[PDB]
Amino acid sequence: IDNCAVGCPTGGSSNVSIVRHAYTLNNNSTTKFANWVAYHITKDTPASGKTRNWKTDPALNPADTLAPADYTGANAALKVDRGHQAPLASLAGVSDWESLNYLSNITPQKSDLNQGAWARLEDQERKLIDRADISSVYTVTGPLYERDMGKLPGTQKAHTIPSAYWKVIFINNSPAVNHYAAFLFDQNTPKGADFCQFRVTVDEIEKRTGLIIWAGLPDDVQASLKSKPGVLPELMGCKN
């Protein structure tokens, strides 16, 4: 199962990644959240109406990830939601869809971001697959840890709440020949914010995460395309 197409990211804290049909993920046993999550949307992956039964990822050591009990009181204290990294509705059609609700694929994401600009991007990201000429959407998403966001009140486990979230997207085959995009949202993004205003370069993300995305691309392609914002957002309703 290849959920990256042009090479999954290198630089993750964990040397081994979890590969599922729903996604491929690299966990961080120190922060308790995934360094990055790569997924592949196709015409047969989206599905609506699925339920959200939060569960501890059975593939990880319970001490290196969070359990449902750890989120107790989180919303009232920090105004955060249990935010999905790999989106439920866009991939709930896969055989192991339940893993989309494993806490390894979740982080304490501010409600205004989760239900705001982040959800609208997910909506447009999913809509791309409806286009006749678009057969695949390959996405890599993950958090940033640049400032103290406080701690979950219901757990004694050492963890680090993200300060921002990014998403790198490309359609069909490879960014070497296809449209791509990259976004970066701060945890405190306003509820009504236009997701189009947060377009960035892949290079910026790599520099703020320590990862190398699209790690299988030839050197020249990486050097010339990663520092240039893509035009994929224009197909998602964005301008300029």
Element (H, E) at 14: none
- When the beta carbons of 111 and 178 are compared against Mg ion, the nearer one is 111
Helix (H, G, I), strand (E, B) or coil at 74: helix
Cα–Cα distance measured from residue 55 to residue 101, given in angstroms and rounded to the nearest whole number = 7
Give the DSSP letter string of 191-238.
TT--GGGGB--HHHHHHHH--BTTTTS-HHHHHHHTTS--SGGGGGT-
Identify which of residues 151 and 199 has a Cβ nearer to its own copies in the complex: 199
Q: Rounded to an integer, what is the distance from CA 236 to the centroid of its chain?
A: 18
Taking the complex as a whole, the smallest distance from the CB of residue 184 to its own copies amounts, in Å, to 19
Nearer to Mg ion, 35 or 109 (CB): 109
Q: Count residues near its own copies (CB under 8 A).
A: 23
CB of 195 to Mg ion, least distance (A): 13
In the numeric block, the tokens 């995460």 are attached to 209
90 lies in the site for Mg ion, by CB under 5 A:
no
Sign of CA dihedral 77, 83, 89, 93: negative
> Of the ranges 61-69, 93-101, 114-122, 214-222, which one interacts with Mg ion (CB under 5 A)?
114-122
Does residue 114 interact with Mg ion by CB under 5 A? yes
84 binds, among Mg ion, its own copies, none (CB under 5 to 8 A by kind): Mg ion
Report the site for its own copies in 156-175 (rule: CB under 8 A).
171-174
Q: Which does 53 bind (CB under 5 to 8 A by kind): its own copies, Mg ion, none?
A: none
Q: Give the CA distances from residue 20 to residues 55, 94, 132, 137, in Å, rounded to whole numbers and listed in that order.
A: 16, 9, 26, 17
Q: Residue 117 half-sphere exposure, CB side, CA atoms within 13 Å?
A: 25
Please say whether the beta carbons of 193 and 65 come within 8 A: no
Q: Which of 130, 133, 148, 219 binds its own copies (CB under 8 A)?
A: 133
- Tell me if residue 84 is catalytic: yes
In the region spanning residues 176 to 235, those forming contacts with its own copies, defined by CB under 8 A, are 176-179, 221, 224-225, 227-228, 230-231, 234-235
Q: Is 139 in the site for Mg ion (CB under 5 A)?
A: no
Q: Is 114 annotated as a binding residue?
A: yes
**Strand, helix or coil for residue 24:** strand
Q: What is the rounded CA–CA span in Å between residue 189 and residue 110?
A: 9
Binding footprint of Mg ion on the chain (CB under 5 A)? 83-84, 114
Residues with a known catalytic role: 84
Binding site for Mg(2+): residue ranges?
114
Q: Name the residues that contact its own copies, by CB under 8 A.
A: 131, 133-134, 171-174, 176-179, 221, 224-225, 227-228, 230-231, 234-235, 237, 239-240
Which residue numbers belong to the known binding site? 114
